Short mmCIF file of C-alpha atoms and ligand atoms in Angstrom, two decimals:
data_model
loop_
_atom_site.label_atom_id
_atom_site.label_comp_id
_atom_site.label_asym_id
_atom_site.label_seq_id
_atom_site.Cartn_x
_atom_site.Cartn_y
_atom_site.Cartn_z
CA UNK A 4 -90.12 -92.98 11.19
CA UNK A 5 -86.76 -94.03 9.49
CA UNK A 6 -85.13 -96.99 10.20
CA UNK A 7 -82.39 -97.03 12.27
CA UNK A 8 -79.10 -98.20 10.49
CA UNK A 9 -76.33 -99.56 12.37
CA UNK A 10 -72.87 -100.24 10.92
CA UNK A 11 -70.86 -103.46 12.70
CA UNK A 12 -67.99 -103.56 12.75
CA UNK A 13 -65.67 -106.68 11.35
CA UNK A 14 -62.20 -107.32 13.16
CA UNK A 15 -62.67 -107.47 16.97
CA UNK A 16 -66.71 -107.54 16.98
CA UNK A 17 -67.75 -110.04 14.52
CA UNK A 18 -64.48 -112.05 13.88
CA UNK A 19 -61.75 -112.67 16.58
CA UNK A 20 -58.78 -111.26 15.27
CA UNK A 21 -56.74 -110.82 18.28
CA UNK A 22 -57.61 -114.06 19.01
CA UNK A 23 -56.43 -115.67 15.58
CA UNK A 24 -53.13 -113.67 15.27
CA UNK A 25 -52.08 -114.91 18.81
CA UNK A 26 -52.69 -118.37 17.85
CA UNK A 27 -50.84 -118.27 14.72
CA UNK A 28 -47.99 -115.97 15.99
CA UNK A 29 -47.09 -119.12 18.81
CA UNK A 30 -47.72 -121.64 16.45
CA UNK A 31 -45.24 -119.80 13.67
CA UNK A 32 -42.90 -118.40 16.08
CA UNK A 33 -42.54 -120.36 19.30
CA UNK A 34 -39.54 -118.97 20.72
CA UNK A 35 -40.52 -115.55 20.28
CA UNK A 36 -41.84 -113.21 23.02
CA UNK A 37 -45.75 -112.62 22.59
CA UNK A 38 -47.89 -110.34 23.98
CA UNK A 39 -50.90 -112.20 26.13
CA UNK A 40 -54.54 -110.80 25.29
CA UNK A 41 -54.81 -109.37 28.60
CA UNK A 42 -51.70 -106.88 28.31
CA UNK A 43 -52.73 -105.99 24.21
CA UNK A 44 -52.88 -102.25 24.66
CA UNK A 45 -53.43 -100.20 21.64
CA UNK A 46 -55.55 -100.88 18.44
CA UNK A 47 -51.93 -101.91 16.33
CA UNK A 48 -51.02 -105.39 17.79
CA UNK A 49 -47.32 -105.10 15.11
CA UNK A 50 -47.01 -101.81 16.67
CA UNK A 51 -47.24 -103.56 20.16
CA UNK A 52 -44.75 -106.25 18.99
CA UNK A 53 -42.71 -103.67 17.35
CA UNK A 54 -42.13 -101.97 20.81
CA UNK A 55 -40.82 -104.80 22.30
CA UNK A 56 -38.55 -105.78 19.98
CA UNK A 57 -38.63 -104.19 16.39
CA UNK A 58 -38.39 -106.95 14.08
CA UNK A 59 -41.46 -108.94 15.94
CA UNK A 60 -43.59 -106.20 14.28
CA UNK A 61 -43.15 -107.91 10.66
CA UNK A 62 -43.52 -111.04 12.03
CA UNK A 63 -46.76 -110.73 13.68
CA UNK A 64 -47.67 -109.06 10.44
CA UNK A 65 -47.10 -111.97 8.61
CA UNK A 66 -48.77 -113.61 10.33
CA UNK A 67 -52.10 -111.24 8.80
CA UNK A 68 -50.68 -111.55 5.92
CA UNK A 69 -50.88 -115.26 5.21
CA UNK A 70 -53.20 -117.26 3.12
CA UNK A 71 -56.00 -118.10 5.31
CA UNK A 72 -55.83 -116.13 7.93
CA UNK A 73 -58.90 -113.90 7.61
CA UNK A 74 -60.61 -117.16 6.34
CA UNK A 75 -59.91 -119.25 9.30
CA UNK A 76 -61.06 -116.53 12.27
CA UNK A 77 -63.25 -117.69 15.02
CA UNK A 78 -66.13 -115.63 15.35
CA UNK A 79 -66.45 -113.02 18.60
CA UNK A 80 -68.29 -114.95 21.25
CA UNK A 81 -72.34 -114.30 21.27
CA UNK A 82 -71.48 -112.20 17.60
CA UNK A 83 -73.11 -114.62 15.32
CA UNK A 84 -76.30 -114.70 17.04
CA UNK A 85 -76.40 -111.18 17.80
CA UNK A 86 -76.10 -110.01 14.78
CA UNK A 87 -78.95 -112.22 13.05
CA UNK A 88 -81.08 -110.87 15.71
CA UNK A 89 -80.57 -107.17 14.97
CA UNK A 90 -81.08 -107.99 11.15
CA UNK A 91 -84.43 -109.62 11.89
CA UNK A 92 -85.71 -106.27 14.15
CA UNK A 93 -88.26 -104.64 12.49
CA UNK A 94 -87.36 -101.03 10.84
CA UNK A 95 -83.61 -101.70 11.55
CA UNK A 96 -80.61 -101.81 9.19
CA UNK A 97 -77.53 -103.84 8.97
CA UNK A 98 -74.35 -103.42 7.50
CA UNK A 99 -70.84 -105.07 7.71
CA UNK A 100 -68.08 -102.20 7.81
CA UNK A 101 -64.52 -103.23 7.59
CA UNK A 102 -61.42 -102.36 6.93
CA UNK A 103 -59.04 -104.22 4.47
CA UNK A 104 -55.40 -104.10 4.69
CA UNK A 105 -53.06 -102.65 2.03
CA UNK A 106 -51.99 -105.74 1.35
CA UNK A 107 -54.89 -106.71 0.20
CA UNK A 108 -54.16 -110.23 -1.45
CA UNK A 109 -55.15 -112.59 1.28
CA UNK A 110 -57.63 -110.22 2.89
CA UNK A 111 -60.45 -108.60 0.46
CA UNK A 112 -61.46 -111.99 -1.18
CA UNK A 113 -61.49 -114.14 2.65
CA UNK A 114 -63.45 -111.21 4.72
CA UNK A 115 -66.29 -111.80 1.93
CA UNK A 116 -65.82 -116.02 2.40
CA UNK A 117 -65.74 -115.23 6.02
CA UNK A 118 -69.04 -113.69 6.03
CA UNK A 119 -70.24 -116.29 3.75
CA UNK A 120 -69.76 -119.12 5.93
CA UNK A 121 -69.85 -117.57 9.66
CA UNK A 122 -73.28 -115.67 9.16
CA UNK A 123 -74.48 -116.79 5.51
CA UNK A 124 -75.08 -115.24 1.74
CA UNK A 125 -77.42 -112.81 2.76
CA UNK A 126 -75.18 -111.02 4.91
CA UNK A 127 -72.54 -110.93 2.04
CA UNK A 128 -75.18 -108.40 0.49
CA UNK A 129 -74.31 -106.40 3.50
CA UNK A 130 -70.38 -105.95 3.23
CA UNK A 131 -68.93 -103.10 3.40
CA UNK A 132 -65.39 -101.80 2.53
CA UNK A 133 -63.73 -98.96 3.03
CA UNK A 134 -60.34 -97.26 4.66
CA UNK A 135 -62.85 -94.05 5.67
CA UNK A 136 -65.64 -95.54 7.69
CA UNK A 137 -66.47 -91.44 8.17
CA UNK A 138 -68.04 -91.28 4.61
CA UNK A 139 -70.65 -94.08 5.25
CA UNK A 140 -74.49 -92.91 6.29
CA UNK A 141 -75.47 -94.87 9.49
CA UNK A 142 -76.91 -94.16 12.82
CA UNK A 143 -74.30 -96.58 14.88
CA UNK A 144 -70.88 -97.65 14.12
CA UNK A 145 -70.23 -100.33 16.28
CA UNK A 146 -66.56 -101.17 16.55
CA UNK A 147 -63.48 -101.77 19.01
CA UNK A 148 -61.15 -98.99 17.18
CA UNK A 149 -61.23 -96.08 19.85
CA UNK A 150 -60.28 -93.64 17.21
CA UNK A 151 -61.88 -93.42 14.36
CA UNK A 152 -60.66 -91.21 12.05
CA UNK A 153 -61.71 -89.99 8.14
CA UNK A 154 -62.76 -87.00 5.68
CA UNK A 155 -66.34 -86.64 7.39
CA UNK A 156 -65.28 -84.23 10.26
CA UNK A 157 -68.68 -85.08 11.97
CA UNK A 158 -69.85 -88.86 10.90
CA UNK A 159 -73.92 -89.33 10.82
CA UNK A 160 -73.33 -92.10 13.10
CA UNK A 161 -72.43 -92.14 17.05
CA UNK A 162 -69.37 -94.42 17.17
CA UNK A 163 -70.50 -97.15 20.34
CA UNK A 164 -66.86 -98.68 21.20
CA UNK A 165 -67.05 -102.30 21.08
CA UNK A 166 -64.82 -103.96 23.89
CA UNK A 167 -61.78 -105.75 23.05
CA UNK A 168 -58.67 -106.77 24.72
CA UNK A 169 -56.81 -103.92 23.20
CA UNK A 170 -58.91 -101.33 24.32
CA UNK A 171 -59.99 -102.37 27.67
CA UNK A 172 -57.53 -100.08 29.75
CA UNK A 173 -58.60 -97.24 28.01
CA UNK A 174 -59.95 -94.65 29.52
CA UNK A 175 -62.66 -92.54 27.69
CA UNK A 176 -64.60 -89.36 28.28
CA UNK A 177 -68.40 -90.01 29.52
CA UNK A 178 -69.87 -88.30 26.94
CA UNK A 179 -68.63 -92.24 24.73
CA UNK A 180 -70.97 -94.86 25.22
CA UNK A 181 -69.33 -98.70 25.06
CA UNK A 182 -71.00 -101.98 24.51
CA UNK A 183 -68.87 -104.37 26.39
CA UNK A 184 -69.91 -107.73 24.78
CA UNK A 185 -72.50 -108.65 22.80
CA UNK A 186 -74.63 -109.75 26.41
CA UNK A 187 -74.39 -105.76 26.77
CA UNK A 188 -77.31 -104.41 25.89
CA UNK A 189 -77.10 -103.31 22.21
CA UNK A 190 -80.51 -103.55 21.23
CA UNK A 191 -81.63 -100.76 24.46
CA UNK A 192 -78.47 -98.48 22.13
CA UNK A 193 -80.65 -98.89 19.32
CA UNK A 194 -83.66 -97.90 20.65
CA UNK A 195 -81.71 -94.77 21.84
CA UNK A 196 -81.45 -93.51 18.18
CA UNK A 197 -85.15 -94.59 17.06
CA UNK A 198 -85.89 -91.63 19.64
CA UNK A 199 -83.80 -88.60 18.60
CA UNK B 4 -65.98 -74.28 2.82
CA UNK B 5 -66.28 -78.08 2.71
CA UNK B 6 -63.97 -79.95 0.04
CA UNK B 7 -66.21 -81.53 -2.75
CA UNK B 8 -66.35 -85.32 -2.65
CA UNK B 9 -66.84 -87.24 -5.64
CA UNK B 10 -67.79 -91.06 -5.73
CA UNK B 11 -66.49 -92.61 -9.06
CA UNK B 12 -68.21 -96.07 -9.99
CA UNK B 13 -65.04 -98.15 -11.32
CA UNK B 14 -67.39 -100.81 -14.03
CA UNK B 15 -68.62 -98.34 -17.21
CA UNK B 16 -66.97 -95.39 -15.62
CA UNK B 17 -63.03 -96.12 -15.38
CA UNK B 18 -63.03 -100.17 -16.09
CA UNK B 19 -64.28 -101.16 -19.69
CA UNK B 20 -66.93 -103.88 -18.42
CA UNK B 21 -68.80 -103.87 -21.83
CA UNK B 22 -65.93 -103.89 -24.24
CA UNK B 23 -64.13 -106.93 -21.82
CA UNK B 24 -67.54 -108.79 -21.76
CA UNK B 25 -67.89 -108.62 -25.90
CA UNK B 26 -64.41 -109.70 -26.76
CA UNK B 27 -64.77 -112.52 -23.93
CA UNK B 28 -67.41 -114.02 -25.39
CA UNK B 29 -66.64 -113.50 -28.64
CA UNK B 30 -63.67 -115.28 -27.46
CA UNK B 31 -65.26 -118.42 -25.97
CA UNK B 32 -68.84 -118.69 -27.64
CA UNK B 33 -67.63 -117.42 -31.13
CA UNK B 34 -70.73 -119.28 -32.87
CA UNK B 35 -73.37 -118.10 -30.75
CA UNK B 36 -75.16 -114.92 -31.58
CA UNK B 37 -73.58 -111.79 -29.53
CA UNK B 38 -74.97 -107.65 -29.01
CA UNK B 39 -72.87 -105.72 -30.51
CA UNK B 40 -71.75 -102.65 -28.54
CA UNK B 41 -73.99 -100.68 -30.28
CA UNK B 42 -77.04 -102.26 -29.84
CA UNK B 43 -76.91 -102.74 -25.79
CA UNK B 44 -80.02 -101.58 -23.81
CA UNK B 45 -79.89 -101.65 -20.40
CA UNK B 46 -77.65 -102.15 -17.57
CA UNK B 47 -77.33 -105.61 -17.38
CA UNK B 48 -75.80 -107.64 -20.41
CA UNK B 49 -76.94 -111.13 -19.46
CA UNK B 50 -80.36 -110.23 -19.45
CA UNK B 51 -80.31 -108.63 -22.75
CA UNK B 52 -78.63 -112.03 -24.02
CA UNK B 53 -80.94 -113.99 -22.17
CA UNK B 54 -83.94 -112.35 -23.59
CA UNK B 55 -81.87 -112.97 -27.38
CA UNK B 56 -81.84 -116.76 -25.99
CA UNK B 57 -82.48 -117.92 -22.23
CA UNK B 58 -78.85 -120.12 -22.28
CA UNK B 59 -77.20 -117.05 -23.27
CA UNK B 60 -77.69 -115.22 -20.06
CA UNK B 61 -75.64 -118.56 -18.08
CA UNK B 62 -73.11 -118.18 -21.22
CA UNK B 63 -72.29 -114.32 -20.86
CA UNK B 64 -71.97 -114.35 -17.20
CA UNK B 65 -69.49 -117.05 -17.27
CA UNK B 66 -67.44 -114.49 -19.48
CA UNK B 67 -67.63 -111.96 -16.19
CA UNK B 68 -67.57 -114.73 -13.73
CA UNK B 69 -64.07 -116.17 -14.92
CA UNK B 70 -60.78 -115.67 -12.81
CA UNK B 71 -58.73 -112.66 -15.20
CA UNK B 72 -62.01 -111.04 -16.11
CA UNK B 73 -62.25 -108.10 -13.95
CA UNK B 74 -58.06 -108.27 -13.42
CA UNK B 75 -57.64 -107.48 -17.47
CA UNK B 76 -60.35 -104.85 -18.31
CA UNK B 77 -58.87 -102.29 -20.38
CA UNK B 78 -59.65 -98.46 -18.72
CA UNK B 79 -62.20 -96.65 -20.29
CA UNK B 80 -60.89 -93.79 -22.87
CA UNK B 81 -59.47 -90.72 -21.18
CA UNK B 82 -60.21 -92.44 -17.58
CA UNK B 83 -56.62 -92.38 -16.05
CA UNK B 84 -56.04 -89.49 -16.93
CA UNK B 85 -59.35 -87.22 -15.75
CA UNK B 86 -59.17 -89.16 -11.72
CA UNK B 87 -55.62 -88.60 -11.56
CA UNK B 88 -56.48 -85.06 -12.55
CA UNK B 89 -59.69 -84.92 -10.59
CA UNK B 90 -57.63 -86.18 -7.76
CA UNK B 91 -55.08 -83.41 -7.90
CA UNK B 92 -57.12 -80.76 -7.19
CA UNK B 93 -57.41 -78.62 -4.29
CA UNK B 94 -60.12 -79.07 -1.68
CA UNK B 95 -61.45 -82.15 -4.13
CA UNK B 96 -62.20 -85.44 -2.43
CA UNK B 97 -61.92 -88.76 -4.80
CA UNK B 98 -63.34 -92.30 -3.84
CA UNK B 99 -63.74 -94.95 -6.23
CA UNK B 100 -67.28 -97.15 -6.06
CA UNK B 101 -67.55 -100.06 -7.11
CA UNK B 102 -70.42 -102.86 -6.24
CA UNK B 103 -69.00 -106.46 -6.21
CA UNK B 104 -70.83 -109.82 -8.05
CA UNK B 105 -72.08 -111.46 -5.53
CA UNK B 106 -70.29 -114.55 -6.91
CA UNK B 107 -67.36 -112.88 -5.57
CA UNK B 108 -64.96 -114.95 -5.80
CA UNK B 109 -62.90 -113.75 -9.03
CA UNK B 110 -64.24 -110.46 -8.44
CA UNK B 111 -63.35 -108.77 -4.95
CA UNK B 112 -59.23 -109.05 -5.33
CA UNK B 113 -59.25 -108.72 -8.92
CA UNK B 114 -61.08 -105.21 -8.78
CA UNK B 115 -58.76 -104.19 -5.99
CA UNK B 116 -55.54 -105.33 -8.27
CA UNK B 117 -57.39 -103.61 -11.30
CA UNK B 118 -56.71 -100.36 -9.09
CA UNK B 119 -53.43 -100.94 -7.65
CA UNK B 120 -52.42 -101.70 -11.54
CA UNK B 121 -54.17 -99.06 -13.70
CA UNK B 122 -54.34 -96.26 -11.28
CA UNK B 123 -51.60 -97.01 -8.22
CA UNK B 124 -51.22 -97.33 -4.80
CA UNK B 125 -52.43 -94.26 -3.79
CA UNK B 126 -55.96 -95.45 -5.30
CA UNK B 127 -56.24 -98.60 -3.67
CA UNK B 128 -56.92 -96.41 0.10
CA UNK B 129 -59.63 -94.58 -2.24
CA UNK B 130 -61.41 -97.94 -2.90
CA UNK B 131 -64.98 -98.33 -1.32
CA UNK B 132 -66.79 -101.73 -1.99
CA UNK B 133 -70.64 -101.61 -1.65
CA UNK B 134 -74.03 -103.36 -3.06
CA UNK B 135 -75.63 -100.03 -2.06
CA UNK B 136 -74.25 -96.61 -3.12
CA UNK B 137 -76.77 -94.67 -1.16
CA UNK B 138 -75.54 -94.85 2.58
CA UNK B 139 -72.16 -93.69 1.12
CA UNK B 140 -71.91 -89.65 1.23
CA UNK B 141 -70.53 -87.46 -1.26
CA UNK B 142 -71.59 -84.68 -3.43
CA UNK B 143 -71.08 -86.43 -6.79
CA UNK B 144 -71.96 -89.76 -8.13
CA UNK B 145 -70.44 -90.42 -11.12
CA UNK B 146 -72.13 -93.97 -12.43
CA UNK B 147 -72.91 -95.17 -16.13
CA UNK B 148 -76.33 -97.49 -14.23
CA UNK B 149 -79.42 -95.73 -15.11
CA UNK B 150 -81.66 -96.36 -11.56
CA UNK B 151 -79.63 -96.35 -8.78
CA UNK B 152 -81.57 -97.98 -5.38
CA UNK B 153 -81.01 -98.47 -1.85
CA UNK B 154 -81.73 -97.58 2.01
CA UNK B 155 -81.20 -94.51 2.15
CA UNK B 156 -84.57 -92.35 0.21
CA UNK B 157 -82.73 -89.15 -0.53
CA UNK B 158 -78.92 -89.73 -1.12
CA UNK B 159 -75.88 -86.82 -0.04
CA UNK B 160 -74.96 -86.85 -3.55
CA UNK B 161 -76.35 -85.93 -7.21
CA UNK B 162 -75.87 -88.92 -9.48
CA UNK B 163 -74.13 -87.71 -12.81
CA UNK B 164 -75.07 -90.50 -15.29
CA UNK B 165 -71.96 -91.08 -17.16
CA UNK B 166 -72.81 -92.27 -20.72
CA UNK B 167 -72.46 -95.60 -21.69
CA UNK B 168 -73.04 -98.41 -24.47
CA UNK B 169 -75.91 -99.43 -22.78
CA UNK B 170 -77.56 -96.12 -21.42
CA UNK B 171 -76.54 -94.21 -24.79
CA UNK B 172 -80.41 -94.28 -25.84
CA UNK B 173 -81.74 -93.52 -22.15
CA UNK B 174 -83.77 -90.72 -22.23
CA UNK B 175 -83.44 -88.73 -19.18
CA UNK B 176 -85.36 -85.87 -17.56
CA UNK B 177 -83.77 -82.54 -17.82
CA UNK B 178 -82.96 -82.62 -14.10
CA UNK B 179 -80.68 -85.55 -14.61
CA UNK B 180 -77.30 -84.60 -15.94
CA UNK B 181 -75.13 -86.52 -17.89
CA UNK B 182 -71.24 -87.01 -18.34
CA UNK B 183 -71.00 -87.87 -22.09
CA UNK B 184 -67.56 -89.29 -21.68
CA UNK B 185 -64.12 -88.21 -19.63
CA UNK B 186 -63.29 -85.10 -22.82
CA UNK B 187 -66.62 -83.86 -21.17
CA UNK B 188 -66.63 -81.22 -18.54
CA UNK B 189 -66.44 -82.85 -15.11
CA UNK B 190 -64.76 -79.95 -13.99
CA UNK B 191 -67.26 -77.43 -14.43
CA UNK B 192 -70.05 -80.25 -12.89
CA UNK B 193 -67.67 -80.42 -9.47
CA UNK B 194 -67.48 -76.64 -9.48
CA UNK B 195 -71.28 -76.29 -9.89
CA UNK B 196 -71.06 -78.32 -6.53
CA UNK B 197 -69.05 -76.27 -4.79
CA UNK B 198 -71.21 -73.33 -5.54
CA UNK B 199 -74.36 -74.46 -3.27
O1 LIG C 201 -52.22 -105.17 14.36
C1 LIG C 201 -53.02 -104.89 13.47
C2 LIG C 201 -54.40 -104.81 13.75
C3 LIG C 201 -55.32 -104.51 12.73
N1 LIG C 201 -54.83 -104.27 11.43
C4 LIG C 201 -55.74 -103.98 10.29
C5 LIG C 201 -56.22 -105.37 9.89
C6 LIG C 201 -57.55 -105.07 9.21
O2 LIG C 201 -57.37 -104.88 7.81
C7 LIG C 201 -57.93 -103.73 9.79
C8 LIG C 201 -59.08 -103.88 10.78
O3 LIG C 201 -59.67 -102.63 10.77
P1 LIG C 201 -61.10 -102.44 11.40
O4 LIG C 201 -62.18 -102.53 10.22
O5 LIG C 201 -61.39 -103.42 12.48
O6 LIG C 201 -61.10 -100.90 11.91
O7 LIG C 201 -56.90 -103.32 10.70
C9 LIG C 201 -53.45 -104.36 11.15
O8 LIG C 201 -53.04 -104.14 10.01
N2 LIG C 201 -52.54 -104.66 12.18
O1 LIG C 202 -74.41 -107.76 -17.22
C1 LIG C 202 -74.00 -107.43 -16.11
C2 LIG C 202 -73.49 -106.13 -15.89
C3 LIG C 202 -73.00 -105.77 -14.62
N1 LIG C 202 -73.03 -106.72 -13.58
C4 LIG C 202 -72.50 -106.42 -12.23
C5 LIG C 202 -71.00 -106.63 -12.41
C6 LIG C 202 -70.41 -105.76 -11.31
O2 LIG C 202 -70.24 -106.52 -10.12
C7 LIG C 202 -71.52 -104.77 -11.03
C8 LIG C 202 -71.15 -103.39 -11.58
O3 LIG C 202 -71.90 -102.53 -10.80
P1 LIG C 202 -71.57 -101.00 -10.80
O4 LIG C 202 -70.62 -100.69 -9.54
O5 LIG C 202 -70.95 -100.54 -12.07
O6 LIG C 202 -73.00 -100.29 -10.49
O7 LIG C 202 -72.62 -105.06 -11.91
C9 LIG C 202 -73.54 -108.02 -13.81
O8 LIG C 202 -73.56 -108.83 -12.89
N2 LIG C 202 -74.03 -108.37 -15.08
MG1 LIG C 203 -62.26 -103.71 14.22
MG1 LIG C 204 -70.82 -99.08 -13.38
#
């Protein structure tokens, strides 16, 4: 009866973060050591940087925190088109669920001008934000975080673990389903929640 | 058991939208005909201007669509004081919820700033940005709009209409309770939560 809802996730499913703060780490910081997409383990890339050498961890974070940097993000390959596709299925919802930082200057105001452009106004009707992803209603939450954490000690939605450089080494219990790109077959997930 | 989670709507509830928008237009259109406090009906204040004068509509929202707008908003009386209070107490659960213009431009930052400023740090991880209230979950809603809509057909919480300018002359069934401003007793309302 219902329709199913799914919440998608921003950073890492829709827009390439990793992708973005790699590119503008090398191009700010040349000489530095960085940390190749392929060996990003863990969901904190400054935390990652931090390990290798602690004061790399605030400058990969400013790299975040500049003006433009959430504007600027290529989108995650196949994203775009995947997600207008899911928001045209009949009897299915779609909402954007992200994260801002603390620092929330250069962030808040580009993730909405970053939906804007990349998918289009009516998605910007769609946004989401929140630091507690457990307190939104949905049926999925699509997104690469592999622990996601909040007040709601059991979420409405199953979390579906979208694939990302940082999380491809990990290991997780059968029992959590992944998608691992958007040629993965999301829509077959959704049709697994119209049935319950 | 369960802590009780209140939603509290930021616009009419801790931000003074109404008072802002009158003194900004007063402001910047001081020979055009304005709606006094007193006299507003209904949520929205550019349609009651518009249906004064159709150019007054454009006029008033370029009052709320100006950059300082939503940064400057005085807090509504007592405000502060009752979610710093409200977030204080044991096994109580405080987000704020807010929905965005979708002209967002002046809007999204200035509403997180707004928080960071009046309330504190602390309040700016409490911050959930949303054009539909009803796929959030909590027990209370505490909102000064009249009809609140969206997915979700039945809502987690029970929306406590907090009184208003415009929603003063509302009448309400007797199933729909009211906060009648912050010296009201949002206390016992949160406890009568906690009870079922
Ligand atoms: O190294 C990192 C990686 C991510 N984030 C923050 C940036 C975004 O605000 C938020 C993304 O959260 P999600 O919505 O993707 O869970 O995580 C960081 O602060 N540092
Ligand atoms: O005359 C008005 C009154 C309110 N709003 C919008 C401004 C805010 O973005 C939003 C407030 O929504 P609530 O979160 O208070 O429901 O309403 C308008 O666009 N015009
Ligand atoms: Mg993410
Ligand atoms: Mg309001």
């Amino acid at each position: 009866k219902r329709p199913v809802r799914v919440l998608v996730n921003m950073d890492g499913v829709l827009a390439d973060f990793e992708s973005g703060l790699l590119q503008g780490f090398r191009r700010r910081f040349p000489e530095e050591p960085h940390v190749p997409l392929e060996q990003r383990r863990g969901f904190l890339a400054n935390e990652q940087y931090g390990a290798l050498r602690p004061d790399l961890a605030e400058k990969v974070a400013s790299v975040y925190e500049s003006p433009g940097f959430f504007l600027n993000l290529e989108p995650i390959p196949g994203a775009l088109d995947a997600l207008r596709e899911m928001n045209d299925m009949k009897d299915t919802e779609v909402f954007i669920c992200t994260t801002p930082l603390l620092k929330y200057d250069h962030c808040v105001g580009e993730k909405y001008r970053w939906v804007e452009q990349n998918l289009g106004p009516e998605f910007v009707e769609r946004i989401i934000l929140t630091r507690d992803k457990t307190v939104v209603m949905g049926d999925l939450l699509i997104d690469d975080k592999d622990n996601i954490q909040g007040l709601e000690e059991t979420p409405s939605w199953e979390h579906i673990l979208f694939t990302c450089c940082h999380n491809q080494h990990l290991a997780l219990p059968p029992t959590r389903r992944r998608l691992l790109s958007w040629s993965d077959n999301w829509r077959g997930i959704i049709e697994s929640k119209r049935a319950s």
